[PDB]
Amino acid sequence: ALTQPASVSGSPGQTITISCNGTSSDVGGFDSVSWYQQSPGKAPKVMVFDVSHRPSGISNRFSGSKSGNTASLTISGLHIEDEGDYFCSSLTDRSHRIFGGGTKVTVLGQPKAAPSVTLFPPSSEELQANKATLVCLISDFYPGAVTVAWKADSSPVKAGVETTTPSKQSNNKYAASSYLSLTPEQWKSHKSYSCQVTHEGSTVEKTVAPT
Amino acid sequence: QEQLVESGGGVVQPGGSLRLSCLASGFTFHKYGMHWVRQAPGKGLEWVALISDDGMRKYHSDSMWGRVTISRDNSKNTLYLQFSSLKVEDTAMFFCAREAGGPYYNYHYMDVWGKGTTVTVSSASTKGPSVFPLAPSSKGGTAALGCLVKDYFPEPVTVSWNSGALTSGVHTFPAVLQSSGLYSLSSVVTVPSSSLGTQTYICNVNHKPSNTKVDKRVEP
Ligand SMILES: *[C@@H]1O[C@H](CO)[C@@H](O)[C@H](O)[C@H]1NC(C)=O
Numbered sequence: 515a516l517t518q519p520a521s522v523s524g525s526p527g528q529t530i531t532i533s534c535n536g537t538s539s540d541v542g543g544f545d546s547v548s549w550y551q552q553s554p555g556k557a558p559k560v561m562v563f564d565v566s567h568r569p570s571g572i573s574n575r576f577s578g579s580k581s582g583n584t585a586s587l588t589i590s591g592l593h594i595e596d597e598g599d600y601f602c603s604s605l606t607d608r609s610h611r612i613f614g615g616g617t618k619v620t621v622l623g624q625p626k627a628a629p630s631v632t633l634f635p636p637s638s639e640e641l642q643a644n645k646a647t648l649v650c651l652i653s654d655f656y657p658g659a660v661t662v663a664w665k666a667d668s669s670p671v672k673a674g675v676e677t678t679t680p681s682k683q684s685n686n687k688y689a690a691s692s693y694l695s696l697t698p699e700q701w702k703s704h705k706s707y708s709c710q711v712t713h714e715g716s717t718v719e720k721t722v723a724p725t
Numbered sequence: 726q727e728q729l730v731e732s733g734g735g736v737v738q739p740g741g742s743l744r745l746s747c748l749a750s751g752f753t754f755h756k757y758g759m760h761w762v763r764q765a766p767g768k769g770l771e772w773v774a775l776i777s778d779d780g781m782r783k784y785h786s787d788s789m790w791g792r793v794t795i796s797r798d799n800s801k802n803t804l805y806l807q808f809s810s811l812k813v814e815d816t817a818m819f820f821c822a823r824e825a826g827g828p829y830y831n832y833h834y835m836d837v838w839g840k841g842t843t844v845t846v847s848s849a850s851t852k853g854p855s856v857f858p859l860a861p862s863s864k865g866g867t868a869a870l871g872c873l874v875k876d877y878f879p880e881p882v883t884v885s886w887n888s889g890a891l892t893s894g895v896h897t898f899p900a901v902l903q904s905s906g907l908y909s910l911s912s913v914v915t916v917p918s919s920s921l922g923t924q925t926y927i928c929n930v931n932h933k934p935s936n937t938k939v940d941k942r943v944e945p
Contacts, residue, residue, distance in 0.1 A: 548834035563834035616769040637857040679767040691898040
């Protein structure tokens with residue numbers, strides 16, 4: 515997977531750029547980088563191809579570049595209609611295609627808002643039913659993009675993690691939730707379990723413990 | 726004009742097989758390579774396979790481990806994707822896409838997409854949820870408590886609090902699809918710590934599909 519920023523945000527009129535860091539077997543080994551825009555509930559749409567070229571009838575304020583093994587997509591003079599997810603894609607050494615993980619572009623329309631984070635431990639009722647689940651709840655943030663990283667004690671954790679896509683609350687801010695599925699024995703084994711949400715630079719953290 | 730429509734998705738069983746189809750129109754099908762691209766719920770686009778204009782050359786993603794086979798019929802203007810040994814982690818939407826080209830040489834980007842077809846892989850029938858109470862922890866100022874509504878299938882389940890008499894400070898979140906093939910979701914309410922032990926917080930969960938209604942008191 516080519517590497518994109520989870521999220522990049524700009525205000526209307528401003529100029530913004532999404533990077534696409536690959537390797538010499540893809541981004542750097544060919545000049546066949548394309549970028550796709552997927553809007554909320556739609557099928558992707560080609561925006562750029564062969565690095566810097568634009569398909570017939572696509573705004574000139576979308577342009578592409580490449581230096582070494584990373585490509586870039588630049589959007590000058592952001593409009594609201596640009597909000598969505600964007601994916602880079604490249605030809606590979608094995609004659610395959612490969613996509614970047616994607617970047618949510620938001621066109622800021624209100625002031626930043628830090629997320630409120632609450633983390634619940636396994637209930638007693640669940641542990642007796644021989645299961646365990648940490649539930650990390652996230653609300654009241656703008657823009658609606660967060661990175662959720664889990665840690666058992668001090669060491670990172672990627673197995674059993676499931677995170678939702680941020681949705682708009684009634685207060686026009688965003689909420690997401692993140693679950694870490696454990697076994698009753700894993701939960702009991704460790705000293706603590708932190709849940710770290712990173713939003714627009716800053717990181718709020720909450721922590722829970724077995725007893 | 727240039728159009729593709731995917732079809733054949735729906736709910737399927739792990740270990741089973743399935744065949745998706747893309748029906749083309751608005752362009753000379755037999756002249757273009759065609760891809761399948763998948764997208765798990767809320768994750769990124771992900772390349773699956775490419776087949777050449779004449780269907781004699783196929784390329785597949787190494788991370789499908791050989792479980793998918795792409796093919797086509799140029800007489801029917803149709804592209805196909807086949808599975809075997811389906812797994813829950815195969816659950817995703819599936820997009821058919823054209824490989825842009827001209828005098829034909831393949832030009833190395835996807836210029837025509839369908840609105841994909843969804844494949845949900847689960848071995849379950851109609852499973853009613855477990856509801857576990859997320860009790861308010863030792864705090865106090867503001868208290869957060871809730872209900873964990875897990876292991877259910879299919880969507881959706883609806884959640885009210887104190888029979889709808891409680892509405893302020895309620896965050897009911899969207900459902901995650903777990904490794905199991907079952908769904909979990911959560912609902913929290915933000916209330917004053919001073920009201921604990923004097924107010925009673927019950928969450929009312931209705932899973933219309935399995936016709937299961939449940940109320941759970943959440944207490945310290
Ligand atoms: C992508 O960026 C990172 C540093 O942020 C670097 O490790 C890598 O070499 C870059 N790729 C190239 C060659 O541009």
